[PDB]
Structure formats: C-alpha cells, structure tokens
Design a protein around this ligand. Structure first.
Ligand SMILES: Nc1ncnc2c1ncn2[C@@H]1O[C@H](COP(=O)(O)OP(=O)(O)OP(O)(O)=S)[C@@H](O)[C@H]1O
Ligand SMILES: Nc1ncnc2c1ncn2[C@@H]1O[C@H](COP(=O)(O)OP(=O)(O)OP(O)(O)=S)[C@@H](O)[C@H]1O
Lengths: 219, 218, 110, 218, 218
C-alpha cells in the first residue's frame, strides 16, 4: 500500500479520540493548578516547587535536577503502566512551570547559540511526549506565569504553535473563570471542528474534562 | 567437523573458569574464547597444560567426525526494502525505520562423505516475518522455500553428535545474520536518536536473523 | 519498584498530615508576632530584635550574626529533640524578620 | 611435552609432502613447518582436513606425555674472549677471527612430575673446545662440569619416548646456540671479506653450539 | 604471616609511645605506624635501638607462623546501582544519593601449608544490606553465599594466634573496602553540598565495607 508506506492517514478517524494538549498561563494565585488537577486523575511533574496541597488525589513527583527530568520522561511509559496497575487513574501529565524548564535546561547547557540549544531541548521534549501521547491516551498540560505567558519568543512560538488550547485564567462574590475568548489585550485560542460551536468561551469552576467535552461535543 | 570439549569437561569436574586460568597461567579471556568454539587456532602449549591439569589424554579434549559441510551464498540476491518513516528517531523500534517487502536468495550446501564422493543440495531461502524477541530487540525470520527436494540433507545433519550439531547451527546462523544485515545497512541511511546515542546502522548490525526450517531442528 | 526508584508518591497520603508554611506580612503594631506565638508552642528565632514580651510561653533564641544563624539552622534537628525532651512543646519555628535575613546575608557576601 | 606425528604417519603411508599439500589445499611451506615441530600454533581446520585425509583419529595425530621440563640460563655469565687477528679476512676460518679463553655459566632445570611435586636440578656448563664439523663450519662444544650430583635428571630424561626425547634435545641446543652466539657477537667487532660478502657477525650467528654430556645421549 | 610485637611489649612495660620516641631518637609518626603493622619495611637501625632499649632479643620483637594466605578478586564483577535522588545535597545520608540493587563477585583464596602442598578454596560474596554504624557514617555489609563447601578454610584460619588472626582480618577488609568503593565511585557522579564541603565521592571513599561470615569470627 503506497498510502501506508507514506504517513498519509484519514482525519475523521484521527480527530475522533485525539488527546489534546492544554497550555494554561495565569497570574499569581489564580488557582491555575486547581484546574489541571480538579479531575483528581493527574500526574504532576512539579519542578523545584510543591503545589500538590490544592489537589485532593493523584500522584506527584518532585523534579530537582535536569538529569532527574530526563529520567522520568524516558521511563514515563513504564510509570503510567504501574500507577494504572496500582489502580491510580492517570489521564493527564502536567509540567508545573515552563520557566523552570528554561532554568534547568540552561544549567545543563552551561549566548544565542546557548538559547538556540535551549529551544532545541524544549522542541525535542514535546515531540517525544507527543508520540507517547497518542500511544498511552494521556492529555498533556503545561502551565506558566503571566509576565502573554512570560518567556523568550523562540520558546513561546514553539509552545503556542504546538498547543491545541491556550487559555488565560483570571478571577472576576469573586468567581474563578477561564477566558479563551479572542482579544487583542491577551492571546487565547481553542481548536474545535467547523460543525462544533462554542456558545460560551468562558468557563467558571473549570476542569480538563469540561474543556474536552466542549471541544468534542456541542457547547 | 572438530570442536574442543573444554566446556563439558570443566562442568563435570565442577572447576570454574577463573580458577583454571589462574593455575594453568592462561589469560581468562583466551580460555573463555577457547571454552566456546569461537577461536580458530589453539597453541600447542595450551593443549598440554590443560591435559596435564585435568589428567585427560589429548583424545578426550577434541571430538572428531569425518563429515564436512560447506555453505555458499548467492553473490546477487533479490531484495526490496521500503522506508517506513513514522519517526523512528523517538522510539528505537526498527520496524518504524524500514520494512522488507521481499528478500529471497539461494544457499548451496555440499555434504562431503567420509569417502571422496560428495552430495550437492541447493536451498532457496525467503523472508517470512520480523519476530520481536524482546521489546528493544527483534530477529528477522527466514524460511527455506523448497524442503521436500532436500529431505536427504536432514538425514546427514541429525547423524552428527549433539555437540557438533549445535556448533554447525551456530555457523549457518552467524553467516546468515552477517549476510542479510550487511545488505540492509547499505540500502537504508542511518537515523540518530534525539536523546549513549544508538544510530540506526548500529541497531541493524546488532539485529540477528535465525533460519526457521524442518532440516535444522535445534 | 520503578515507582520507588523515582520520587513519584501518592497525593492523598502526602496532604493528610502535611505541615504548611505560613508567611504573615503586617504594618507596625498589628500584633503579627502575637498570632504566631498565641499557641504558646513556638520557637522564635528573632534577628537583632526582642519581641518575645508579647508571647506568654515558648523558647526564644536571639540571632546576632550570620554565622550564628547558620549554626542554629544546621543544628535545628538536634535542638527540637532537646526542647521536646525537656517537655517544652515546639510545633512552629518562626524567623521574626525577612528584611534582617537580607541584611545579614548581604554582610556575609560583602 | 606434545608433538605432531605427521612426519611419521606420512612416511609409513609413503605419501610425499607435495601431494598431501595439493590435496588438503594447505600451502606446502606451512605443512613442511608443521611436519617438523617448529610451528607453535595449529589451526583447527588443519587438524580435521589431515585427519579425514589419512583416516586417522585426532588421538593418533598428537603424542602426549605428562612430564614437563623447564630451562633457565644465568643472566650474568663469565666470559673471556681474546681477538686472534691472523688475517681472518682472507680465509673464513672463525678460529682466526677470535678465541674463547673461558665461557662458563649455570642452567637451572625443573623436572615437574605428573603429580604437583617438582624436582630441581642445577647444571654448570663450561667451554671445552671448538670442533671443526666441516672445513667451512665449526661447532663450539660445551661440557657439563657437575654430572654426578645430577645423575637423577638422566633417569627422568630417558623415560620419554624417542620422538619426544629428540624434540627436547633440539630445544635445549637451539637455546644454547642462541645464548652463546649472542654473547660473542657483542664482544667481537665484525670483519668483512675482501672478495655474496660474509661478515664475521653473520658467520658467528650461523655457527651452532651443541652440549656434550652423559645426561643427554642423543 | 609475620607482625611486629612492639604494641604489646610497650603496653606490658607501660612505657608511652612519646617517651620511647624521644629516647630512641625515632620520629613519633614512624614509631606509631610501626606500632601498628601498617608499615611495609623496617630499618635495621630501628630493630637494634628498640631491642637494646627494652632488653628484648630480636626473637621477641617478631611473631612468625609458617602459614601463608593469598586473596584474588574477580576482574569482572556483577554490579547494579540505581540513583535514588531525594535531595542528598541537603542531608549527607549516602542512602539518599544511591542504592545498590545487587553486587556479587568471587574471591579466590589459596591456603599454602608449611609443606609445598597448597589447598584452593573459592568464596562467592554478595551484597546483603547497608548498616548505619552512626548517624553520619554507614558500613556496607557483604555475606559469603557458599560457606558449607568452604568449611575447611575456617579450620586453617582459627589455628593462627589471636594477634595474627586480627592482622589477617584487617587485610581482607581493607582490600574489600577499596574494591567495592572504587567500583561505586565510577558509576555514580559526585554531588556537592549547599552549605569544609563534603562531595559525594569523598563520602563514598570514606565509607568502609566489612565482610560478615562464619569463616571469619573476629
Ligand atoms: N470561520 C471561523 N468562524 C469562527 N471561528 C473560527 C473560524 N475559523 C477559525 N475559528 C476559530 O479558530 C479556531 C481554529 O484556529 P486555527 O485554524 O487553528 O488558527 P490558525 O491561525 O489557522 O492556526 P495557528 O496555529 O493558530 S497560527 C476554531 O476552533 C475557532 O475557535
Ligand atoms: N489578638 C489581639 N487582641 C488584642 N490586642 C492584641 C492582639 N494582638 C496584639 N494585640 C496588642 O498588640 C500588643 C502586641 O503587639 P506586637 O505583637 O508586639 O505587634 P507586632 O506588629 O507583632 O510587632 P511590632 O514590633 O509592633 S512591628 C499586645 O500587647 C496588645 O496590646
């Protein structure tokens, strides 16, 4: 089959159960981690930080070194199988901070040559995670700090391009709502098929499930 | 056919390779290679030191059989290999890097009897499938197309002692693995992994191919 | 166990008895120290200051030098064991002023 | 002690070295060296081709004896050599070039039995005379000084088979000839002939020294 | 086996190391090392000065026993080490830095008798656990796998005098500690503490491993 020999594949079947990636950038104390772990079915790879207190249930692994980060990503297939074997439910893998990934990769490589290598490390990680993402049915989520998400463009470009849904979480009694509605002041994008229509792009008390259901089924 | 019997003798007496090497003053690496039939030449000094040490006559050390087999592989094989792409670079699964549509060729075997008379048998071997022995390693499997015409070859093979038969099977496989691996490495370009580094060519050379046929049963 | 070999651990068990850290910033005379030592079960590592008068009971250790600060932190495990052995109850370790930590660390690096 | 029996087997069957080399496809030079016990290593392929060709079991090809002898030569010998002049350059008679006043040293021999037990015998060897085997060639003759103390060594030597004994005598002589020749070449400077050219050093190296003693009778 | 008896003699007479060094004019550091059996060579002058000072014959100074033991460690051991992470940098507890999944190898011991005859015993040693001797220091504990086959070795060991036995046990342990420590330091990278500085490699070298087995009881 010349079709099979090349990578050509049908879209209707590919978009049916696809596991979307989610990037959520927020200001301080906006409860961004709450959203990612609200489903209580998450594995949090936090970096030099411990915000697992807000989460009620799940598995959390502290990352203290770039070497430690490389190991967990390489053995991530094996890990997911064990937590599921233990009966723990993992549907989403979360990296707590993109800025810390910049800091750790920089230490490993320690100029624009250095910055380009740092970008190369970041792009390589996403490609590796994605091939496993299709294999193990795990949603990926990365979170960062507002300062658009704060970082150097080469990274921002890569993150925004690859990310399916990019959202900004803000608090508006006070209410916690995720707003992905288009806007010049802040940049947000949710990907849905032509037939699917999002009547409301702001979600109050949001969870990863609710977003998934909105992007697969009618809002 | 001829092989050293050192591995069997040491096992019955229960002596370990390390102790024998320390006493007979022969370097461990050489004694281990000679324990297997891998070495091509043996120094007269080694034959006497070991024979005096294990109170064994030279007769016991070597097993002989007048039979002798020869294998020749076609200079021009028919091979078709189709690149599969699919991002092999991320996960090291050879199947993703390349797929063999069909690889078939002929191996000519001459079973020379103790008498001067010799018999000629011609084997045609074709690709069947790529089995996955372990998650990280695979073994290409090749099956002989014509076996009914060459049934007589089997009668000569099983006549050998078990130790000689195991040696012959290693020899036929080692050559096959080198032949097929060398052909593939040329047609497919190497791909280096993102995350020490294992290039595609190194993985292909490591890969081993074992013939699956009624004639050879072990 | 690959799980145990890495640091992966369950959250339900980790958040059950976790000891939370508390940062309390206040204006002058807002009784911020009162709150921290109201439980009367506290060890106050005050820095170049003495506000232990508001507290009723507990243990207070004056910190006068960066070298003194390093020593108390390094030997803090041993200390907690002794005050508890004496029967004094220590459940919270308090550093009176972050700005003084800035001042002392600056002297050490200058 | 171990030696190949190819020279004896071929002689009884009457096959010439040339015909055997042509058939077994082994180069004449290698087969001739292996016919003598000069070679140090033998390739497994050679053991089988010859054994199948002469219908001989591997046992027959090798002769073994558990005895084992070792020889060590003194690092510091006592040697006095006096130049004779007398125009050696014209006629190539070594005696004219140089004369040995006295060359004496010790050879330490350890006769290891089949059992772990070993016996030590110490031989003292001295220069006696330079015999003229032919007009153009001479053989230095050295005689063991103490033989009565080392009579027991002789009892172990003659216990070996004739073929092994001839091999051992070649080994002791080859070493002695190399030892004495190397010492002399250094002390005496070379002289080139007027009238291809044979320098004194080349003649000294060619010269052979054979030990003359009761212990060794062949 | 041979050791100096200076430590015992001085203790019975009650003389302190400092006074003896001042009188015999031997530097304290050398006399202390020689008080232990650590030194390898002793100067003739030291043997006489001390012997005249303590009215002791040379016989008394040295204790001798014709027995002699030899230990050889496998060049290729089987070792698996898994990094534990867990922020060792903060608290210096080796266990946090790394964990040994399994480390097993063989030590070959030759007990040479007073007679030329020697006996060979082969010991297989494996990792068991890492005991914590003190809060800041640990001692890896290794246990001999096969002891029933090597019961005879124990009979030779306890035959020595207590002073010689204590010396032999120090020698076997010092070598083991160097062997295991050197292997681990290579596999695990060093980690420097935040708060003089004690790197991981320095701590690993300081760590000592003591064999725990029935054969050695002291
Ligand atoms: N015609 C349209 N009407 C309404 N909304 C639309 C329309 N086209 C796109 N959108 C919105 O934009 C989403 C798709 O954006 P994309 O097509 O991925 O944008 P793009 O600019 O082509 O790609 P990048 O990756 O963002 S540069 C949809 O899910 C809607 O939210
Ligand atoms: N809970 C309280 N109820 C009533 N009065 C209080 C309370 N807490 C503090 N005070 C008053 O404040 C006094 C103690 O003030 P401090 O605890 O010294 O203030 P602080 O802000 O912690 O420290 P500084 O040195 O003033 S910045 C008490 O003696 C009372 O007068």
């Amino acid at each position: 089959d010349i079709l099979t020999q090349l990578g050509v594949k049908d879209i209707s079947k590919q978009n049916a159960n696809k596991f979307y990636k989610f990037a959520i950038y927020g200001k301080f104390g906006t409860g961004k981690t709450t959203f990612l772990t609200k489903d209580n079915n998450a594995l949090v790879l936090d970096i030099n930080e411990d915000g697992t207190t807000v989460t009620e249930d799940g598995a959390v692994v502290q990352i203290k070194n770039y070497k430690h980060f490389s190991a967990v990503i390489k053995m991530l297939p094996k890990i997911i199988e064990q937590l599921r074997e233990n009966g723990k439910q993992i549907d989403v893998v979360v990296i707590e901070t993109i800025q810390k990934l910049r800091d750790i990769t920089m230490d490993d490589i320690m100029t624009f040559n250095d910055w380009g290598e740092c970008a190369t490390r970041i792009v390589s990680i996403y490609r590796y995670i994605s091939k496993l993402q299709e294999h193990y049915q795990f949603h990926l989520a990365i979170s960062g700090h507002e300062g658009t998400i704060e970082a150097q463009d080469q990274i921002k470009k890569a993150v925004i391009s690859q990310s399916d849904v990019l959202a900004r979480m803000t608090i508006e009694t006070y209410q916690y709502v995720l707003n992905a509605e288009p806007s010049n002041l802040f940049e947000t994008k949710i990907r849905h098929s032509s037939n699917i229509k999002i009547n409301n792009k702001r979600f109050i008390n949001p969870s990863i499930n609710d977003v998934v259901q909105a992007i697969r089924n009618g809002n | 056919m001829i092989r050293n019997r050192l591995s069997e003798l040491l096992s019955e007496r229960g002596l370990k390779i390390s102790r024998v090497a320390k006493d007979v003053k022969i370097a461990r690496s050489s004694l281990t290679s000679m324990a297997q039939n891998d070495s091509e030449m043996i120094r007269y000094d080694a034959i006497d030191k070991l024979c005096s040490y294990l109170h064994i006559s030279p007769s016991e050390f070597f097993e002989h059989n007048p039979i002798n087999f020869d294998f020749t592989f076609d200079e021009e094989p028919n091979y078709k290999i189709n690149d599969v792409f699919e991002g092999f670079e991320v996960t090291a699964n050879i199947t993703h890097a390349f797929s063999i549509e069909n690889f078939d060729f002929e191996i000519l075997v001459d079973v020379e009897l103790d008498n001067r008379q010799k018999l000629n048998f011609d084997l045609d071997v074709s690709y069947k499938e790529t089995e996955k022995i372990t998650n990280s390693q695979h073994r290409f499997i090749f099956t002989i197309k014509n076996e009914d015409e060459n049934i007589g070859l089997k009668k000569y093979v099983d006549s050998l002692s078990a130790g000689l038969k195991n040696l012959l099977f290693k020899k036929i496989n080692q050559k096959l693995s080198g032949y097929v691996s060398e052909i593939i490495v040329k047609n497919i370009d190497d791909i280096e992994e993102l995350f020490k580094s294992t290039t595609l060519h190194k993985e292909i050379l490591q890969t081993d191919s074992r013939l699956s046929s009624d004639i050879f049963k072990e």
